[PDB]
Design a protein around this ligand. Structure first.
Ligand SMILES: NC(=O)c1ccc[n+]([C@@H]2O[C@H](COP(=O)([O-])OP(=O)(O)OC[C@H]3O[C@@H](n4cnc5c(N)ncnc54)[C@H](OP(=O)(O)O)[C@@H]3O)[C@@H](O)[C@H]2O)c1
Ligand SMILES: NC(=O)c1ccc[n+]([C@@H]2O[C@H](COP(=O)([O-])OP(=O)(O)OC[C@H]3O[C@@H](n4cnc5c(N)ncnc54)[C@H](OP(=O)(O)O)[C@@H]3O)[C@@H](O)[C@H]2O)c1
Lengths: 307, 307
């Protein structure tokens, strides 16, 4: 019954196990119906406890089929024989029998070493990569849909030419591309390319995220704070409202994260904010003065995927 | 090699998976040889990546047999048949073939429901308990020693009468009792009872912990502050030095936790701190003016275990 992820979703990166169960419970009870997960976030079992508690309880008013659940194939599981195994492990942890969506997390194949390092690195701090064609990984992802383990598959951090090439050999097309989009990195050409080619888009770090002590770039933005103040809301909600007005299609969704119940609830009201054309112009100007790609493997893995 | 846990250990409660690997690696490389873990800390797999890496090759300089590794049976696994199952799971996560010590985490048997809630509570917010005699659980713990899965077994949060009764039914004696001990909760009568009966003692929250937002009571103490200042050290090293001078026996250990590399290294120098007899009297008087048991299930589970 859902064709694409619900427009307003909920992220789980960096939420420790001890916070994320309460966070997901709060999101679900607040009304979010799209939860973004990943194996590499090291918290799927805690999330699964939230799903089990809510979906098994006929009193919560929320059933499994009301919720879109996404997870992601980690970089060290790109060898085809590892794809189904991780899918099943992720589902077991999440206490689900199927995923709505399973993504290739990055177009980077990491070695899977004998201690199971999530981020294997050589002495220079560069990620240790494995020889796995992206098409081999994709074919393995397709088999998950054929078996019925997952309803849809997609990609994340794929660039235009990777998407173009995928479209030329995919038997099952990627449902979406999940990529970094926010007022400091609007990513317009790539979004348009996806949507023009019938691929949905999911905006990660939609409020600018928590990145290098980690900082929240949104807290320094005078433009977002001025619009928020004048409208009796938060800069967070103004950012989220900007996404959904800018790209007014059910094929585009946002996945804001908080592990703080008050913020989870407050962010859910972003759909009530009405931005003017002047508001949209002002926000669209932010990246002309400050443009930043935060989630850049050139930085943390010494692999310049986006160059 | 080790009859009792090394005196200076390292705790891992509340360390998220994303921080705890680095934390454990920092501790081991600094010189700690006692790592305190638990299933319920939701981070054993991350800790395992540290152990797996370090113990794989002699080139690290630290062999498995150089390190004392403790874990703990969670409250929902008191049913005898669940004890070995959890022991094996814990060990798989930690990437070890044996534990030096496996503890009964609490003398509370929680129900293990169909969604695996770690903290099952009723409508009134009270923990939901299961009918499992403590002696039944203990017999199942003894089997782990007979099989060779663990070298030693022990208890945590056991009171004097529970310990007396255990000594009377045990075929394998508990090696230690792990309990809350710090300047605000010196726990003298219980410590003395254990040691007098040939049961070791491991001091958890040795610096007063991070507890109800969460606060560190040690940073408001003018007594530890004045002594730390006088001796050119931290209140943290003074509190740790107090423990090891007060109870000067190989049977008594402390497990200070930090997920912060600089603090992990700094705490390890507590052994160089030379406290005087008047320093000891000053620290010993703190609980007369401020006595607090932080880790009290009367608060968070509505079960008054310590009353
Ligand atoms: N490669 C990938 O596919 C990829 C990469 C990045 C992210 N993602 C996904 O996208 C999700 C969202 O991105 P993100 O987590 O990077 O960043 P984000 O959602 O843009 O921002 C998260 C940060 O904002 C804070 N925050 C949220 N609401 C707030 C409010 N109302 N007031 C004040 N602070 C607020 C959070 O703090 P608290 O939590 O402390 O409240 C956290 O520090 C992730 O969780 C993950 O699911 C995917
Ligand atoms: N029921 C049980 O058997 C039980 C119960 C509680 C604890 N435990 C065990 O006992 C261990 C120790 O107890 P604990 O973790 O409750 O409390 P603790 O070790 O007394 O104190 C931990 C707190 O002190 C901070 N800290 C440590 N060293 C510091 C320094 N040098 N400077 C500034 N801050 C410092 C830590 O912050 P950062 O980490 O942010 O640096 C953390 O907030 C636990 O981790 C666990 O393994 C067992």
């Amino acid at each position: 019954s859902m064709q694409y992820p619900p427009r307003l979703g909920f992220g789980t990166w960096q939420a420790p196990p001890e916070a994320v169960q309460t966070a997901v419970e709060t999101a679900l009870m607040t009304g979010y119906r799209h939860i973004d997960c990943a194996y590499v976030y090291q918290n799927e079992e805690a999330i699964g406890r939230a799903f089990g508690k809510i979906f098994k309880d006929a009193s919560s008013g929320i059933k499994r089929e009301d919720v879109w659940i996404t997870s992601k194939l980690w970089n060290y599981n790109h060898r085809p024989e590892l794809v189904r195994e991780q899918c099943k492990k992720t589902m077991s942890d999440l206490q689900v029998d199927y995923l709505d969506l399973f993504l290739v997390h990055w177009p980077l194949a990491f070695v899977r070493n004998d201690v199971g390092d999530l981020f294997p690195k050589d002495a220079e701090g560069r990620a240790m990569l494995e020889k796995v064609p992206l098409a081999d990984t994709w074919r393995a992802m397709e088999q998950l849909v054929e078996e019925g383990l997952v309803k849809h598959i997609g990609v994340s951090n794929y660039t235009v030419p990777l998407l173009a090439d995928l479209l030329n050999y995919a038997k099952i097309k990627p449902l979406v591309n999940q990529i970094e989009i926010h007022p400091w990195h609007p990513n317009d050409a790539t979004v348009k390319f996806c949507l023009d080619n019938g691929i949905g888009v999911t905006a990660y770090s939609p409020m600018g995220g928590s990145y290098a002590t980690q900082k929240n770039v949104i807290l320094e933005c005078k433009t977002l704070k001025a619009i928020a103040d004048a409208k009796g809301t938060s800069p967070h909600c103004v950012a989220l409202a900007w996404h959904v007005k800018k790209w007014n299609t059910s094929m585009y969704s946002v996945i804001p994260k908080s592990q703080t119940p008050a913020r989870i609830e407050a962010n859910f009201k972003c759909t009530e904010v009405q931005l003017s054309d002047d508001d949209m112009d002002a926000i669209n100007n932010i990246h002309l003065n400050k443009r930043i790609r935060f989630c850049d493997p050139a930085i943390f893995w010494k692999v310049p995927l986006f160059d």
